[PDB]
Ligand binder design. Sequence first.
Ligand SMILES: CCCCCCCC/C=C/CCCCCCCC(=O)O[C@@H](COC(=O)CCCCCCCCCCCCCCC)COP(=O)([O-])OCC[N+](C)(C)C
Ligand SMILES: CCCCCCCC/C=C/CCCCCCCC(=O)O[C@@H](COC(=O)CCCCCCCCCCCCCCC)COP(=O)([O-])OCC[N+](C)(C)C
Ligand SMILES: CCCCCCCC/C=C/CCCCCCCC(=O)O[C@@H](COC(=O)CCCCCCCCCCCCCCC)COP(=O)([O-])OCC[N+](C)(C)C
Ligand SMILES: CCCCCCCC/C=C\CCCCCCCC(=O)O[C@@H](COC(=O)CCCCCCCCCCCCCCC)COP(=O)([O-])OCC[N+](C)(C)C
Ligand SMILES: CCCCCCCC/C=C\CCCCCCCC(=O)O[C@@H](COC(=O)CCCCCCCCCCCCCCC)COP(=O)([O-])OCC[N+](C)(C)C
Ligand SMILES: CCCCCCCC/C=C\CCCCCCCC(=O)O[C@@H](COC(=O)CCCCCCCCCCCCCCC)COP(=O)([O-])OCC[N+](C)(C)C
Ligand SMILES: CCCCCCCC/C=C\CCCCCCCC(=O)O[C@@H](COC(=O)CCCCCCCCCCCCCCC)COP(=O)([O-])OCC[N+](C)(C)C
Ligand SMILES: CCCCCCCC/C=C\CCCCCCCC(=O)O[C@@H](COC(=O)CCCCCCCCCCCCCCC)COP(=O)([O-])OCC[N+](C)(C)C
Ligand SMILES: CCCCCCCC/C=C\CCCCCCCC(=O)O[C@@H](COC(=O)CCCCCCCCCCCCCCC)COP(=O)([O-])OCC[N+](C)(C)C
Ligand SMILES: C[C@@H]1CC[C@@]2(OC1)O[C@H]1C[C@H]3[C@@H]4CC=C5C[C@@H](OCCC(CO)CO)CC[C@]5(C)[C@H]4CC[C@]3(C)[C@H]1[C@@H]2C
Ligand SMILES: C[C@@H]1CC[C@@]2(OC1)O[C@H]1C[C@H]3[C@@H]4CC=C5C[C@@H](OCCC(CO)CO)CC[C@]5(C)[C@H]4CC[C@]3(C)[C@H]1[C@@H]2C
Ligand SMILES: CC(C)CCC[C@@H](C)[C@H]1CC[C@H]2[C@@H]3CC=C4C[C@@H](O)CC[C@]4(C)[C@H]3CC[C@]12C
Lengths: 91, 82, 1105, 92
Amino acid sequence: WQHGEESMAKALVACKIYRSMAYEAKQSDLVDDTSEELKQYSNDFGQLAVELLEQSFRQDETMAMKLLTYELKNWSNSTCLKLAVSSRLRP
Amino acid sequence: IENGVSMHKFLTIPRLEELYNTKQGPTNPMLFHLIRDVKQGNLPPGYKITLIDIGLVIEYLMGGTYRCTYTRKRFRLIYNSL
Amino acid sequence: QKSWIESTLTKRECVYIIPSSKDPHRCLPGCQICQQLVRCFCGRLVKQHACFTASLAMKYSDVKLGEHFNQAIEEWSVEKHTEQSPTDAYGVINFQGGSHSYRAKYVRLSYDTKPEIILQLLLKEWQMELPKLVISVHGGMQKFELHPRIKQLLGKGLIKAAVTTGAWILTGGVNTGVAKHVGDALKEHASRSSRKICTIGIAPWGVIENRNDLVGRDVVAPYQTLLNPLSKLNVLNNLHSHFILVDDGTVGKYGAEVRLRRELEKTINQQRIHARIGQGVPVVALIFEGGPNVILTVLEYLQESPPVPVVVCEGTGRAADLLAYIHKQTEEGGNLPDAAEPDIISTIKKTFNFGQSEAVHLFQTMMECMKKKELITVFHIGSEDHQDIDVAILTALLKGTNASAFDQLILTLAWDRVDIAKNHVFVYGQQWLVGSLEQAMLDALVMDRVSFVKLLIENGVSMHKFLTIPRLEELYNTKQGPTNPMLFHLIRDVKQGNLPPGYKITLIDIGLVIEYLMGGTYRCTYTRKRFRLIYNSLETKRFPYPLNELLIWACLMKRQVMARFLWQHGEESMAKALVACKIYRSMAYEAKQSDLVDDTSEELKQYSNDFGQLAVELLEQSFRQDETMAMKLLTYELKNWSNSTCLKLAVSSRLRPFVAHTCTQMLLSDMWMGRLNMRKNSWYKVILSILVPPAILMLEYKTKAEMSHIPQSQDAHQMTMELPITRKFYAFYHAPIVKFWFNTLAYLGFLMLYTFVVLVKMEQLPSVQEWIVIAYIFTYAIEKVREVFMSEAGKISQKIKVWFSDYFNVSDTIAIISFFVGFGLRFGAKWNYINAYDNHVFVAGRLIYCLNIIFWYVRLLDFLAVNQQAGPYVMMIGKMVANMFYIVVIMALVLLSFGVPRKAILYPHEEPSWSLAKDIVFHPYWMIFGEVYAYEIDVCANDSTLPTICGPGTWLTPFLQAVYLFVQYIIMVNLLIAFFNQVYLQVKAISNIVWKYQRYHFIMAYHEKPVLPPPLIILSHIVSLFCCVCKGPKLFLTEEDQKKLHDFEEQCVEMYFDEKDDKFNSGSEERIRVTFERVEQMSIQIKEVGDRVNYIKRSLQSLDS
Amino acid sequence: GDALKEHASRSSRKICTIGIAPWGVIENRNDLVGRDVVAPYQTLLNPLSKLNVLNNLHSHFILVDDGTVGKYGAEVRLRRELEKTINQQRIH
Ligand SMILES: CCCCCCCC/C=C/CCCCCCCC(=O)O[C@@H](COC(=O)CCCCCCCCCCCCCCC)COP(=O)([O-])OCC[N+](C)(C)C
Ligand SMILES: CCCCCCCC/C=C/CCCCCCCC(=O)O[C@@H](COC(=O)CCCCCCCCCCCCCCC)COP(=O)([O-])OCC[N+](C)(C)C
Ligand SMILES: CCCCCCCC/C=C/CCCCCCCC(=O)O[C@@H](COC(=O)CCCCCCCCCCCCCCC)COP(=O)([O-])OCC[N+](C)(C)C
Ligand SMILES: CCCCCCCC/C=C\CCCCCCCC(=O)O[C@@H](COC(=O)CCCCCCCCCCCCCCC)COP(=O)([O-])OCC[N+](C)(C)C
Ligand SMILES: CCCCCCCC/C=C\CCCCCCCC(=O)O[C@@H](COC(=O)CCCCCCCCCCCCCCC)COP(=O)([O-])OCC[N+](C)(C)C
Ligand SMILES: CCCCCCCC/C=C\CCCCCCCC(=O)O[C@@H](COC(=O)CCCCCCCCCCCCCCC)COP(=O)([O-])OCC[N+](C)(C)C
Ligand SMILES: CCCCCCCC/C=C\CCCCCCCC(=O)O[C@@H](COC(=O)CCCCCCCCCCCCCCC)COP(=O)([O-])OCC[N+](C)(C)C
Ligand SMILES: CCCCCCCC/C=C\CCCCCCCC(=O)O[C@@H](COC(=O)CCCCCCCCCCCCCCC)COP(=O)([O-])OCC[N+](C)(C)C
Ligand SMILES: CCCCCCCC/C=C\CCCCCCCC(=O)O[C@@H](COC(=O)CCCCCCCCCCCCCCC)COP(=O)([O-])OCC[N+](C)(C)C
Ligand SMILES: C[C@@H]1CC[C@@]2(OC1)O[C@H]1C[C@H]3[C@@H]4CC=C5C[C@@H](OCCC(CO)CO)CC[C@]5(C)[C@H]4CC[C@]3(C)[C@H]1[C@@H]2C
Ligand SMILES: C[C@@H]1CC[C@@]2(OC1)O[C@H]1C[C@H]3[C@@H]4CC=C5C[C@@H](OCCC(CO)CO)CC[C@]5(C)[C@H]4CC[C@]3(C)[C@H]1[C@@H]2C
Ligand SMILES: CC(C)CCC[C@@H](C)[C@H]1CC[C@H]2[C@@H]3CC=C4C[C@@H](O)CC[C@]4(C)[C@H]3CC[C@]12C
């Protein structure tokens, strides 16, 4: 994650990928297990996206708002905000 | 990555497709269940994993109306071609 | 094309073919090997050029005839055959590596690119802000290597020196040489960490391997970072942020930058270094391992346009270290030991194979270098001289340019290096002509560098002779340095919101800003009559107390670190801190009010509370020494601060920890009593003495000595000067405690009568009781008019908005207005004589009184709020009622959710009627209070009280009401109670501070009221009117006492400052991280000694070898 | 005087410190002239003034106006006599 670009987006996708697998474990309820491990992995990346927002907002408030709303185009033409609402990532 | 490697010229389709479908090393029992559902809950007993069937996993995990770049028209063709 | 690089700047193309090293060899037929390797004196192949005009030789033969006389072959020159044809390499590199990207920029250009456009590329195009230092690095051009100690120490110093001065390092940009080792040092030291050491490499284009990659328009240049040693040409060092690359028009050739690199430096040391400062940007030059040309260019600095110093370090390699040798053994005039050239020329032949006669020339030129050693600097890294290359670098630019000590400070001031200034510029035995110090201080203050101001104040400067009217007026009106966007808005409003587009700022217009910020009726010393004249007119312009006027400046311009510093200096410390709290607090409001482009209010809010606590902590200190003197400090006129008072100032800022401090409280208690000694008397003896005046002469009064700390009136002062009987009554009826319990008893007797009037019938004319009521209310009103007009503010529209900003003054206005509507109807009615309550004008009058009286019972909560125990409960009730709005809206919704279906089910034949509005609220509201209307719920039951509204659907109403009460009586009432329970706990946590703060306005009110209460008060108004028509508290201190107070100030002003440092030194975890700081010098030096102990023991056996 | 400065002897404390000098020498003596005043001793370290800069840490300055200026040794006895009538009173 540290490497490349689109850091804030990659962190809010990851939070969504882990959070859904953390649900399908508790849903599928088969031989599989290890969901609260996934729950933690989502909240790990989730805080990373929040701490990048903080940083980016303390520099220029106006540009940070634009970061929450530009189309991504590597991520199904979605938005970092829209992704964070999917994960119910409240902070 | 510090000593001359670049991920740009090193991520080819057979390679990263390999890197998905290896039980060598820390392995997930969940992904093989995820590929089950999206593949109609029907596995060939061997069943090499493509990049394609993964794209349908993400579209199920990301939810809503997400469209992975692994299920697109261009990619789906050049994959078969290559 | 919007690509100024592409437009104005240009590249170079070999547009002609001159076979170089054309030696026909293998593969018998000529053309094949005459087409295999035929380089040019440009450096490329004819087949590698092709260049749209060089392709015309690939097909035929080299762009020339055949043999083509060798008298003419040699004649290349980039002047002759090279066409410019814009650049194609203005991208941005993405050097891949560690857990980051080391992004950098570049450009191609020619060796004769103008020195001004290269600047217009660095600053204008690349946004790079002009430096205050340049480090021209000229060392080894091959892969030289060093050892660990020098690897770290030299690294830090070179880095740190660039950190402080925001410098621009200059290298070749190639990781075979200095650039590798320059760049490395940045890597480990974390110079990037919320920071940038701007770093640039002037290289040539043709060499840098994968140059063809970087080709192309603006792109994320995928420079591949391959360390493949096959590519000797070079790997661009991936730490340098910028790469100017001299596309001279050659490839494989070297030395395209040697002049340009210098010329750029020449036109870097030719611009100003922050306009307040007038100097050229100084330029050092350093030397690492280095070759014979690296020593050669030292002779190109020492004897060059404005002399450029040299910082050859010790211990690096062949060049940098050898120049220390010739430095060391040779005198200040370069006087060699005569056997030097007879044994150094071995060193040259030892280090280099440069030769012997060659080597003789080297040392000879190397002394031609060393003819002036006042200007070079051997950083003796061994023996730790300057202890980082930095201190030698910066010092090197302050010695050897025949510069003056003012010209030496002024540079240190520009750099943020006091340590350089105090240790070198402020050296024993220095000149400092007349106003050099003074000119530096006008520079240090406007630039907001306290640490130089602090130093200068210690090193001969005095603010007393340095604050002149043009000067401090200058110091206001400078956008150089940290600038306030708020003050220019403040000057707008006070200047009618009209700006001349230029509009130089005066001292005068500022005075109107302070009078707007301090508020009320403050009068700055800049708007006075004398000052306003001498200003226009203009020796005497030296400001009797300058440190007062600069503290205003630093605060009006949000220069806290300057404000907080200047506050320490001078006198009137406690006052200056309570003004500052007021200035910032008002700007912190006008930001949130003006709400324009401006911002940064919570920063001001914090600045106010910073100074506020300072005034509180001085009060503490001053009170723990002598309680009585501290009280006098809260009440002496200031006379530099609009004849105000430190207490009065702190009330303006609503600075509660100061007013709720036990010093003020003990003083507020002493003003409450007056000349009554209530520690001996009691409040029941005061009440008795009001109702029985002769007991007044039985009470224990006070002298002048135990009343000297108390601010008194002119009279209360004077009546004590000249204890007889008439003076014993004057002491009693003029105390605030008496005026309270004398208005309180009249107010209680007012309500007893006014209660009697509403409960007893009214005949046509008022009774004696009702007249006494009307008299109270009438005069009570006049009393309220006066305390508006005789308020503290000056603008009537602000005397008004403050008074109506209290709950009980709004209620009294309604209670007074509503009473005389009632009196006018009660009295102006035509009596009926058959029955009083048939005339509806008389009834409306009586019914207004009976509701009017509720205002007057509730005004008693204001009397009770005076008590320390009751007042917190009056605060609660208001906060409960004010903030329960939204729970009660839900409750009213739940109510109609039930009341409307019930009325609709039970009463289905209803025409529209006003009763429908009553019957949907009435019974559902009384349910809230536990009335379930038990015999009305089921209306078809035998025990029903409503057997007639039985009908279809009525069986639904029990189910409805069961749900309603569960929701209403249990959920919603206890949700409201839960809210109220938290209000309770919140108020009790703050109740005592707020009570203590409100004693001030309370006690000062009853210091200004008349001595007669509202029925009899009219005589006090009359006498206090015809006095003025015909014709407040001050601490009167004699000069003998007024003097000692100032002595008590300074002593306690002093003892405070000393204390804070002393406790702060000790600390708790500070001490633990002061230990950890000490854990290094031990570990270093336990490695110092521990390095030698192995050097010791090897000796001992070698001495016995 | 220096040693008092760094050591923070002032810190909630006073080391009482006195300098018996002569009046005539101390440069800017003419400044200190005048009745009870905040003597604006300017602290100029200008080395032109050899005569002396009063060290700014000593709290008290008895200055022997013997009736000379540029002369030296006005205190040599007085300084001692003060000490003689300091070692002549009781010690609590
Ligand atoms: C910043 C300040 C802060 C402090 C606040 C202070 C401000 C307080 C402000 C107070 C304002 C009070 C306004 C009163 C208006 C009365 C209206 C009314 O109903 O009139 C009635 C009588 O009108 C008359 O003129 C006859 C009654 C005699 C005059 C008594 C009212 C004036 C007293 C004023 C004393 C002012 C007190 C203040 C003194 C300083 C009209 O009705 P009617 O004629 O009865 O009807 C006739 C019908 N019929 C013929 C069928 C019978
Ligand atoms: C700030 C706090 C709350 C918000 C403020 C706003 C509150 C909203 C206020 C709403 C008021 C209701 C409308 C009143 C108008 C209708 C009355 C009328 O004209 O007729 C009735 C008389 O009425 C009376 O005699 C007075 C009855 C008033 C009851 C108010 C108290 C109940 C609680 C209310 C508090 C709930 C608060 C909810 C909080 C949980 C009778 O009908 P009629 O046609 O006259 O019949 C004549 C024949 N007869 C003589 C046989 C009868
Ligand atoms: C716990 C204790 C209760 C026992 C439990 C078992 C339920 C027992 C219930 C059984 C339902 C059968 C009883 C009604 C039959 C008609 C009788 C009658 O006179 O009705 C009267 C009203 O009432 C009605 O007309 C209907 C009342 C239905 C209320 C039951 C709701 C479900 C209760 C919970 C379900 C339980 C399980 C779920 C619990 C989680 C008719 O009218 P009136 O009011 O006389 O007056 C109107 C005018 N008149 C006089 C002209 C007519
Ligand atoms: C403004 C409030 C302040 C506090 C209270 C102040 C007043 C407290 C003092 C007393 C309260 C009671 C007042 C007297 C009532 C007399 C009753 C009457 O009508 O006639 C009577 C006598 O009446 C007289 O003798 C006339 C008195 C002249 C006015 C006196 C004003 C003094 C107070 C000026 C203000 C300054 C003093 C205070 C300064 C702090 C005969 O009685 P009755 O009629 O058989 O009985 C009444 C019953 N009834 C209504 C059923 C008929
Ligand atoms: C004869 C009998 C017949 C006549 C009967 C008349 C009926 C009686 C009528 C009214 C009650 C009498 C007193 C007036 C109310 C208090 C005003 C107030 O809150 O002032 C305060 C604020 O002021 C404001 O905030 C200004 C705007 C008002 C706020 C909304 C509530 C009041 C509006 C009306 C709503 C009810 C409708 C009533 C109006 C028609 C100033 O006080 P403070 O100490 O600064 O505290 C404020 C702190 N705070 C700002 C942070 C909160
Ligand atoms: C800010 C100032 C506001 C108010 C200013 C002043 C307003 C002036 C107001 C009134 C003056 C009008 C005088 C009378 C007019 C003609 C009618 C008449 O004479 O008789 C009629 C009176 O009818 C009524 O309704 C009388 C009551 C009206 C006042 C209501 C309260 C207003 C104040 C609210 C409080 C405000 C508090 C605000 C505090 C901030 C009927 O009576 P009758 O003749 O006996 O009946 C004949 C019929 N019969 C044969 C069937 C019996
Ligand atoms: C005719 C009946 C009237 C009497 C009512 C009897 C009932 C009980 C009544 C009241 C108890 C309170 C009285 C004694 C308080 C003394 C001490 C005190 O609190 O001091 C305070 C002042 O004093 C006040 O603030 C008291 C307020 C007096 C007005 C009372 C109106 C409400 C009661 C009316 C009735 C409504 C309820 C219905 C009942 C009819 C604080 O001020 P201070 O300057 O700090 O004080 C001295 C200095 N020291 C304290 C720091 C040392
Ligand atoms: C005849 C009938 C019986 C009479 C009843 C007895 C008389 C009534 C009793 C108590 C009256 C209130 C006491 C005030 C105490 C002082 C408060 C104060 O200074 O400021 C407060 C505001 O103040 C308000 O909000 C005032 C309250 C609004 C009007 C009261 C209506 C009462 C009924 C409504 C209920 C009925 C609803 C439902 C009905 C259906 C402060 O509030 P804050 O902003 O959070 O704090 C800021 C602090 N500050 C003070 C420094 C600014
Ligand atoms: C039978 C019980 C079934 C089992 C019970 C359980 C099933 C519950 C369902 C229903 C309960 C039974 C209703 C029958 C009423 C019989 C009485 C009757 O006819 O009354 C009247 C008509 O009454 C109606 O027409 C009622 C119509 C239904 C209203 C909608 C209910 C929705 C409940 C929402 C559900 C949410 C539940 C809570 C959610 C958590 C007429 O007869 P009367 O009263 O004599 O009036 C006088 C007649 N006269 C004009 C001739 C003079
Ligand atoms: C708030 C203020 C407190 C003080 C005060 O004002 C209000 O309170 C008032 C109440 C008045 C009394 C009420 C009623 C009567 C009864 C009547 O006689 C009845 C018949 C008899 C036959 O045998 C049996 O009782 C005589 C007069 C008297 C006593 C009043 C006197 C004045 C008084 C004390 C007033 C006093 C000035
Ligand atoms: C969001 C909230 C939803 C509920 C609610 O608030 C808002 O919606 C309001 C609408 C109101 C009604 C409007 C019109 C009339 C007509 C009038 O008829 C004349 C009388 C006649 C005498 O005979 C003339 O001669 C009688 C009153 C009535 C029915 C109102 C009652 C209260 C109601 C229901 C209010 C209720 C509290
Ligand atoms: C709507 C009209 C016609 C009917 C009567 C309205 C009622 C609600 C009015 C009449 C008298 C009013 C009271 C008059 C006096 C005060 C004192 C004040 O400090 C708070 C409000 C309070 C307590 C009022 C509350 C509302 C009140 C009780």
